[PDB]
Amino acid sequence: WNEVAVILAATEHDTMLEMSDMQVWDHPPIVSEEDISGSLVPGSKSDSNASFLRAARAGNLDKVVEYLKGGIDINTCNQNGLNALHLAAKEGHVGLVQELLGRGSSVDSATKKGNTALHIASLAGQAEVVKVLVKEGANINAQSQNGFTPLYMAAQENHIDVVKYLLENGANQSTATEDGFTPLAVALQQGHNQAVAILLENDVRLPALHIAARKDDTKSAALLLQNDHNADVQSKMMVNRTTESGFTPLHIAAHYGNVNVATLLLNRGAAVDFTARNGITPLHVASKRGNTNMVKLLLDRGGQIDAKTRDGLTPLHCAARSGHDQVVELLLERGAPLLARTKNGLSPLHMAAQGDHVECVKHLLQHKAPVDDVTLDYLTALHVAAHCGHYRVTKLLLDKRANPNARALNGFTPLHIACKKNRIKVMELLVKYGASIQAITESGLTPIHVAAFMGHLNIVLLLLQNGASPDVTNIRGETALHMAARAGQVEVVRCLLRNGALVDARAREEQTPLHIASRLGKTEIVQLLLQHMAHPDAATTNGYTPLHISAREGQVDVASVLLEAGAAHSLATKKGFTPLHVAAKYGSLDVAKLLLQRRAAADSAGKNGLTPLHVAAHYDNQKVALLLLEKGASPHATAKNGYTPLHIAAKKNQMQIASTLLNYGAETNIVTKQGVTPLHLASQEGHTDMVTLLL
């Protein structure tokens, strides 16, 4: 059958995803001001509209009004949609803006990017242009493209007076962008304490607190937490309110190692062990990221040193997996459970070995961890270091007296595993430290079995050069050559044959590798085995030679290489069947033709007296029966039953095959030993069209 189920990554996947969900997702956007070209190209108003816009940017109200009287539409814009009022408002020309307003320019005209004149002036920091526009009736809460407001633009660039003015005129602090950010958010993102203090001075607060947790802004964090009261329910407090990802401010500060803002939050009542997602605590985040002092503060403030995620990761697990040997040492000195286990039984040592972190293994074994502590499937840390090909941790583990022959759950030894994953470095190292070259699993696979079946040619080479006999058998009786042929690894088969492998080794059913190569159609491997003195007439227990198998499975090319190599063309099995009988049994038509072209007897007979025509008559094989009749098979031959193939076709209701038989001169008035004719069988079985077709 299949040997793939007989021969750990899906085990690693779950805790790997639970350590992947310890990430924090996001910065507020920054506005970029518009670009101005001034080119003439923009129907005879081209050079005039263009020179007019140039005059508006340069700030010359003389040539601008003189141009306006020359009959140029005031709502004239360039490629991007910029008005004379936009160009004037960006540059602080207060007079040009006043005259442009009186001359008839619209206040709330927006470019292609949706910025009104008030937008442009706010981002640029023209306090007086803003005063003119606000007093003239401009929409102070105008949302540009993506929803930015002038208050947002001023707060982003720390234009303080613009912010004080827009707040005095009543600008909405709450109006957020398309993704949810307010002026306070970007003011915190840029590090403008002045702005932040001003916007917080009059009347939103929570996402600002999360940004302050990322930014280590203790000033703004202390400012945001003055209206929140130390209630008896920590969940209601603003210091413990979460993002959309379930993370609290303390979780975030733990992610960025921000010790100061974390101390502030904890002093304002931030709860130290609030879980997010599948049980992730701030200790888990700080530990995964290696933030040593964050871990120190969290433990000092009553953090659970042994808290488990859903699958069982403790903070020491996370720190060990990530190679944060300082957090590992701190956690260990504070008394972390050295042998806490995940749901599949992994110790922190298994994680540290899984990430090739030598220093974490050194500190873990220093604190008396058992070097051969096993998982639930009995995988030592050396097993994991071998599965990952990590050379350094394998060297250290072996140097600290880890057993290189440790048997795993299925009998697998670190050498077996390093051989299944093609780790030449780790395999050679394990052998140096005493791994048994020819140790077997519970299913009897040596390392050369595993490497040969998996096609790792260099490993097969190294094992063969180290003294691995390729003729060790598994519980199915198969040597490395059998499985190397079952999987189709041609180069490995050549390497085994060239290095003394038995060509015709017998397994269960006394079958050689040639039988398996014929069953699976491995044509090139049939060639390779035959070339190395494989007897092509080798028979199994039921009597099949490789020719019989090609006749059963329909492999025509294999039958070709076999017959050209001298395979006996009409050999008997236990039931006395020749390859032609088998071809007539399984409908292999081409193999039957190729068989007959090679001097195969058209009507060979077994112990029972049957001919391939009888067989084809039984199994309702029309084309092969026809090919036999054409090649010279008699339809009047009998068996031990006195049966012609016409009796057989008559009993089992073979309409077409009996048609071919009668058309080829099949005797109808033929009797058996017990006085039976095909009319008696045809009538007894209950076939109408049959008995009709006889007469």
Numbering used by the authors: 1582 to 1588, 1601 to 1618, 1622 to 1638, 2026 to 2186, 2191 to 2682
Task: Provide passages from the article that reported this PDB entry.
Although AnkB and G do not contain AnkR_CT like sequences in their tails, more thorough sequence analysis revealed that both AnkB and G contain a 13-residue segment (denoted as ‘AI-a’ for the AutoInhibition segment-a) that share a similar sequence pattern with the last 13-residue fragment of AnkR_CT and several MBD ‘site-1’ binding targets such as Na+ and K+-channels. As an alternative approach, we replaced the corresponding sequence of AnkR_CT with that of AnkB_AI-a and produced an AnkR/B_CT Chimera. Isothermal titration calorimetry (ITC) experiments detected a strong interaction between this chimera peptide and AnkB_MBD, with a Kd value comparable to that of AnkR_CT with AnkB_MBD. This chimera peptide was fused to the N-terminus of AnkB_MBD for crystallization trials as we have demonstrated for AnkR_CT. With this strategy, we successfully obtained crystals of the AnkR/B_CT Chimera/AnkB_repeats_R1-20 fusion protein, and the crystals were diffracted up to 3.3 Å. The structure of the fusion protein was determined by the molecular replacement method using the AnkB_repeats_R1-24 structure as the model. Consistent with the biochemical analysis, the structure showed that the AnkB_AI-a segment binds to ‘site-1’ of AnkB_MBD (repeats_R1-5) using essentially the same binding mode as we observed in the AnkR_CT/AnkB_MBD and Nav1.2_ABD/AnkB_R1-9 complex structures. In particular, Glu1630 from AnkB_AI-a occupies the identical position as Glu1622 in AnkR or Glu1112 in Nav1.2 on AnkB_R1-5, by forming strong hydrogen bonds with Thr94 and Asn98 in the R2-R3 finger loop. Additionally, hydrophobic interactions between ‘PPIV’ from AI-a and hydrophobic residues from R3-R5 also contribute to the binding.
